[PDB]
Design a protein around this nucleic acid. Sequence first.
RNA 1: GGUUGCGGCCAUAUCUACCAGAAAGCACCGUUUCCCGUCCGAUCAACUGUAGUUAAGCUGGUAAGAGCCUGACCGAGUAGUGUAGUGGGUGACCAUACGCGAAACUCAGGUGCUGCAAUCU
Lengths: 42, 229, 176
Amino acid sequence: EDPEISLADYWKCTSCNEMNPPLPSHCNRCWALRENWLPEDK
Amino acid sequence: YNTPKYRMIVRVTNRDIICQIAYARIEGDMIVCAAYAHELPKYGVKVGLTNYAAAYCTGLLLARRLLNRFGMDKIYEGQVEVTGDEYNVESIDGQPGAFTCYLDAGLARTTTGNKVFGALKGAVDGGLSIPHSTKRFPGYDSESKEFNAEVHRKHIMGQNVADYMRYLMEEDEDAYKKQFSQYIKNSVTPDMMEEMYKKAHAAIRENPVYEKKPKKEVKKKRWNRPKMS
Amino acid sequence: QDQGEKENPMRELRIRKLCLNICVGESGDRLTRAAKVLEQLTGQTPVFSKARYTVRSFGIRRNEKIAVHCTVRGAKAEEILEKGLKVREYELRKNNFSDTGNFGFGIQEHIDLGIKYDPSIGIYGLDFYVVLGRPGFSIADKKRRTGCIGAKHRISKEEAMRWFQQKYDGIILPGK
RNA sequence: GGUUGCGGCCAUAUCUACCAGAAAGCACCGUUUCCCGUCCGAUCAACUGUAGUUAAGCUGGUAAGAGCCUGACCGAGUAGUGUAGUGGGUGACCAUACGCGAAACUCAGGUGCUGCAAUCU
Ligand SMILES: [Zn+2]
């Protein structure tokens, strides 16, 4: 749907196995956060 | 079997504009008349190319060249006055009819105010017969369903570029010097742009014979890579 | 020699649209305040984003008012990316750079960056996912004469890492 | 010898990797006051040909490069198939004789001509 983006930048879920797009940071199937997207706190 | 339904193809490059009028044959299309925007310096304006006024000038030059090639230049002079109203050519009784043609825009977007439609309107002002409406013009209103045609006249006269140059001069110094850099060269003032366009239109109506410069001092040295054995 | 900096006029690493976005758990005045915060941060009018499917894990109905997304281009997107890298303290370690040449992260709170917290306003963060580019990379998206961009002019992941460590002087590749 | 823009006959008419491209022309390319358009001048629409660039696009050549078509004792009259006899086999089937007959593979060739109009040599 986006002509400047590719399927290689799509994010495959580690919890729901769905190849979600770059936005948002929630999973397309499970709405969970992607792995190590925000900075991990100390 | 051989009746020529002529098409006027319009193409817009990033540094020039090409107009052609052709009727296709079995052995390929036959371009009876054509014009390039580089030839606009040979009649009038040596600067300010690829404008909507340049599209109207190219359409008028192509229409006058086609009328000279067809031999119907003396009758059907076209819209001599630069008016924004849509003018449709009526065929002369006792004479040949208007040279009907189709308009080949190609893969260009069919939006109102495009330069291809402006060249079509310039060809219609020159006297070339193609069916078209005033909806895809510069002065048409999409919400009022009407054409004001004074703004279309100013855009045909190139007064929009003159107003843009005036606003860039009164709003900045380096930007007006950078954008209209070669327009500042050779003294193209914000005034007399409509006068220069009218003089160029009158000169295009005066002498429409397209000519080529002879230069036959060409050798056949190979400047390209051929095939290895 | 001459091969060092000559393509840099026509093949420098440039930034395309950044497309800042946040996701709301519901709609209404929270979504209105999120859109107001997005308009205050970006300056452009944001775009509401609907749900693809009703998931109902945390509670979700399809095609509701779910998220807010916008595309930022130019020096404003560069300044927003600089503010995000300063919020991340120039630390994008391992999986931030992609193979195709995308970077990005997520900011936990809009209160720290940008404008300060208010009790009426929320503290919902956002996310950045910036796709880079080269001078002339948009040739495949034109209306006429579509063609490939070429592998040799594409951005590499190691090239993206070098571009990040040059443009931001950033810190990548943590021990974990 | 090159380029542009329309073309015609139409998969021998694809991709990938190097090397080149005099000259012009294309092409990226610079800017959004106005015509137009979106969340975003990214696309589309305007303005200049300046600031730059052959890095991509495009073209040519080179691959014992892969792919695609064409044929071929290329298997090969082969794997086998069906029938017949006065060989049998308890039969099934196997030979005999006849009448049809693949496929993968391999090898050879090619990975298209040309018009119109304009312009650089
Ligand atoms: Zn998931």
